[PDB]
Amino acid sequence: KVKIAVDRNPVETSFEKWAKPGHFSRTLSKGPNTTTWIWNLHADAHDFDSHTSDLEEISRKVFSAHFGQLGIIFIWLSGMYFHGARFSNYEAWLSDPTHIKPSAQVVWPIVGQEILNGDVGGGFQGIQITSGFFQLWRASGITSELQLYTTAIGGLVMAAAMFFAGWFHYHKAAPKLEWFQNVESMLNHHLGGLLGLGSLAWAGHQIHVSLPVNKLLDAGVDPKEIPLPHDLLLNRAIMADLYPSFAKGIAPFFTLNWSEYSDFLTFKGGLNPVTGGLWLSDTAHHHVAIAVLFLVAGHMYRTNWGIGHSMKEILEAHRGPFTGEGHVGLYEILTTSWHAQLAINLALFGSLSIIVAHHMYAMPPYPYLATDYGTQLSLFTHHTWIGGFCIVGAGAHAAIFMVRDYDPTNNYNNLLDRVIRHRDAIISHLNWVCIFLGFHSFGLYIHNDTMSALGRPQDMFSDTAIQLQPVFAQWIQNTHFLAPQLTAPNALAATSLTWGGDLVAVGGKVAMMPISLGTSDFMVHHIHAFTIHVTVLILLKGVLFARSSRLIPDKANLGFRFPCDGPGRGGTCQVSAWDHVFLGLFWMYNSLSIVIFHFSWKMQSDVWGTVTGVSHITGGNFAQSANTINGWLRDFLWAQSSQVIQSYGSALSAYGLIFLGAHFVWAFSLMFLFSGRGYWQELIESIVWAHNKLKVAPAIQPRALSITQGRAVGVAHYLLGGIATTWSFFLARIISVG
Amino acid sequence: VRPVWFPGNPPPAHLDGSLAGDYGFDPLFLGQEPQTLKWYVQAELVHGRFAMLGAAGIILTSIGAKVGLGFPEWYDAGKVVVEKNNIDFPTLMVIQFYLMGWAETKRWYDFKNPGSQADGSFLGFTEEFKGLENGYPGGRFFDPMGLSRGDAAKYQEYKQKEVKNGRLAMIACLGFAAQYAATGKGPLDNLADHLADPNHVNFATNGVSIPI
Amino acid sequence: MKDFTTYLSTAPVIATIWFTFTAGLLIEINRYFPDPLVF
Amino acid sequence: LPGDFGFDPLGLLDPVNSGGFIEPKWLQYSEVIHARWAMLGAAGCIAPEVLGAAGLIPDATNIKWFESGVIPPAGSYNGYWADPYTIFFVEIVAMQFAELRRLQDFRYPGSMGQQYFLGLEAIFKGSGDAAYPGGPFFNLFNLGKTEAAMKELKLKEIKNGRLAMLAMLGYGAQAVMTGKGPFQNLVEHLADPVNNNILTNF
Ligand SMILES: CC1=C(C/C=C(\C)CCC[C@H](C)CCC[C@H](C)CCCC(C)C)C(=O)c2ccccc2C1=O
Ligand code: SF4
């Protein structure tokens, strides 16, 4: 029995507590007397579980917080669209994409920052963007900047609606706990409604707008010439001309003779030779498939009729001999804590964004997309960084739940309990497998560099001396290349020119080519896998030593975040799961940096270039300069640093400036990451003597930062410096050489 | 019970009815504090009076313009007359600012100290430079006709009609502004045209008001 | 409403306002008197 | 209450834990509003078609209903003594007045016959029930003589109103699919019950 439940006027709308800082905590609301008060106030503004302990209260809070997030996103989207409408060379780029470069951000003619207004073509000046909104919009079918304008207006309106909805569903008619707990209804509703109807309406928009106008653009007719979407909708005659099926309306579909609709529901595979994008009919068929799949999926669980399943019953039904009570109680834990959900969802989300990056560089779907190597690189590395961060956050909040809201009683002989039991065996095993991979993979590189600098390259590890071959990967590539003959006989081509095959180029520029795999790539993949396992080890220890330890048996009550347990029993610095997440974030940064370096060098060296054959931007130095560290440093880095270190007097001076600034702040973080607050407080005291002697001591007492505060500020600054440096370098270099 | 600008909704706290034109209209609560409220009262009064002035001047000059009497249109009268005579922008501006500053700072320090202006610190004067109400300095000069000192009911009615016509004049002056900035024309002329054809000579056809 | 005014007079808001004022002033100055070095 | 059949398979009239807009009062209020509208709208959408079919009106008028101007892309008509927008404006102001004061009634019951309104307040006192204020105008003739007849009449009103909502949707779907007029579809399906059908319209 499921229905709708709500409660009225739970909290008023007034500025009273707006004038009361720290009202949410009865602790802080009693006033400030020392500096660290401010830090704490900012720190725990959103720690809803420490605010109070009502599930329903925290729930209403997170609901309205979601609405705020949504409104912000709509705002920023409308901003992008309006900028594209009013300050862009988008219509010029529509006229010619191949030589006009996207530019929407313009600078003001002031003290000297106007030099950045780069001549991007189209008689236009400004700054090149990398986001790819141009190719996206062309793919969609936007021609008139009027469309961008109205789009931005609608986006702003939507943001306002989101904020209003948040205010309403928090202050006027708030829901109830069971209505938040109707999980089977929630899954049915999401999977059916949201995704099914999204893909369906998507297929519709593609078919009736974006397919015809893009057929026309690729046919080369004048852009503004092409008719209007509503005309395309109204006059069935035009669509009949384009695809002779349209004359028959819908009766043939109704009569189940689907084959006749194959004119624009295609299965080509491969790419579109005029734009380098994928076949729009193919993507439309794809989206139709996804639509029906998910809409059928949205009819699984029982809500108010016996038909459908019970998640908890299914859960308990799966029990094993080696496992004891199996999956019992999980339905409880999930129906009761936000943090479990947050951990699971962040993990999946990060992994998914990574897959998005990979798939997208693999099979470029937009027109003229493959051309801007800068845009490709930028999108890839950005989405990869975001994925890494989301996954680390998953780990963090997992451990946080485990400390806070776990209960032992409910789970006597659980999968969870027995895991907690043999945690020691597990962690030891992971340790060893890591150190093994580290040894072998990295010692290979050092052995190479030694065999080189010693004067005996005969004994290095390359494609020339003793070899190593990704036989498995080459085999898979072979098979996916030869698949359509027998495996998918109605497939007209491989789904990616990387499986093998010819070369598609546009505008004197390569769009794709079969990709080689060398001993270099073998070794790089293995370094990847090692650092990944190491990060996983850090986080798994961070979660499995949450409640207690063979060292600290009362870790649980001490909270999730704390500096140490004093110098006791030999010094207990850095023992909290919060510090676990700290160091895990460190190593995540390292790994992602290395992986995007791999990607960039492989692309630049052996895919990119211009057709004459092809002329690779570094001509292929990779497969011989990427298996020694000295070669790495010099030939790749110290090499490609050129344009970024000579970008002055040009619209690229900003990139060099930021390069410098990033080095600076990255180094600055180290003082924080190394110092100790006691010294800071002593120096503060001498400063207070100085001030006070003049009767200017502040009423707010000065206190050095808390230990964990020092740790957090250090890590934030360091990460910022590193990632900013590499970002500036990438952008300047690729925009210069492409 | 007083006619509430939004018939059906009750007035807020600070909006009571003691003042003229208390239709209960402050949906932004800008007058909760009495200091700020008396303040905005004086502001509204001076603005209404200025608007009444401006409307009268504009309309009379516009009539003089339509009739063949050579009077320019208001948005040009300034430049045209200053170039006609031997006037200097700087000297006119500076004298104007002098005199206005004097009178206006006197009104200011009166509002601050409600009585210290008829203290004989002037030439010899008193019982005239002393306020009567917040922004109602009717003495022997500001009310030389002496209606403030007779028939308090009639006087209340006069405050009411004053503030009514003041609000109307504010709205009408903004009217004039938009009329001209849109039609690039004379206000009275736009009037005559809409007379000629209300069905078609109107903002619906002005093609700017409604941007469709 | 007075609650709201005090919320305004809170510290970070006032800091932002004063800094915005100073920066806008400096910018307009460098506009109208470009590249001064002496006097 | 009137016209119920025990049919609420989705079950939203549940009066417990209600709030917001989901409250039987407001919900059935919206239902009766829609009923009266759809009745008027159906009568209108049809009238000129048959009115010119009988030829009683000059063929200048009786264009199909979706062309009278509401959608210029669907075709516009002209000859109106003023512009569509110039009419749209006074339409805005009149509907603003009517709807707003009806709403003020429903929100603060009885409180919309008090402010001086040219004596036009005694009628706006009405009942304490929206959608049924009655009063001298809104029940011009003293109808509901027997309260049994009164409930009977409420029932008949809701019946006809639901029928009207259905008919309006019918007009929409026909005029989009077959593109013709409503009376056109009628004349056709009359001519051929078999060969003038959506099966034939495939
Ligand atoms: C440098 C350093 C400090 C000293 C740094 C401190 C105390 C931070 C100072 C913050 C700013 C600079 C001062 C306060 C700024 C406020 C906005 C107040 C207004 C200031 C006006 C100028 C606007 C620590 O306290 C510390 C603690 C633990 C590990 C490492 C370190 C560490 O490395
Ligand atoms: S202050 Fe630092 S060194 Fe001292 S006990 Fe705490 S964590 Fe250890």
Side-chain angles (χ1 to χ4, degrees), chain A residues 5 10 19 21-22 31-32 43 45 65 68 71 79 84-85 92 97 102 104 109 112 118 121-123 126 132 139 141 152 154-155 159-161 165-166 173-175 192-193 196 198 201 203-204 212 219-220 223 227 229 237 240 244 247 249 251-252 269-270 273 276-277 284 289 291 297-298 306 308 317 320-321 324 326 329 340 343 347 350 357 362 364-365 367 370 374 387-388 393-396 398-399 408 425 438 443 453 455 457 465 470 473 483-484 488-489 491 493-494 500-501 505 507-508 511 514 518 529 542 546 553 556 559 563 566-568 570-571 577 584 609 613 619-620 623 626 631 638-639 649 651 654 656 661-662 667 676 678 690 697-699 702 704 710 712 714 716 721-722 724 732 738, chain B residues 3 7-8 10-13 17 20-21 24 27 31 34 43 48 51 54-57 64-65 68 70 72 77-78 90 101 103 114-115 118 120 124 131 135 137-139 144 146 150 152-153 166 169 172 175 177-178 181-182 184 186-187 192 196 198 204 207 211, chain C residues 11-12 15 23-24 34 36, chain D residues 2-3 6 9 11 15 19-20 24 35 38 41-44 47-48 52-55 58 60 69 72-75 79 82 84 94 98 109-110 113 119 122 126 128 130-131 133-136 144 148-149 161 164 167 170 172-173 175 179 181-182 191 193:
Chain A
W638 171 86

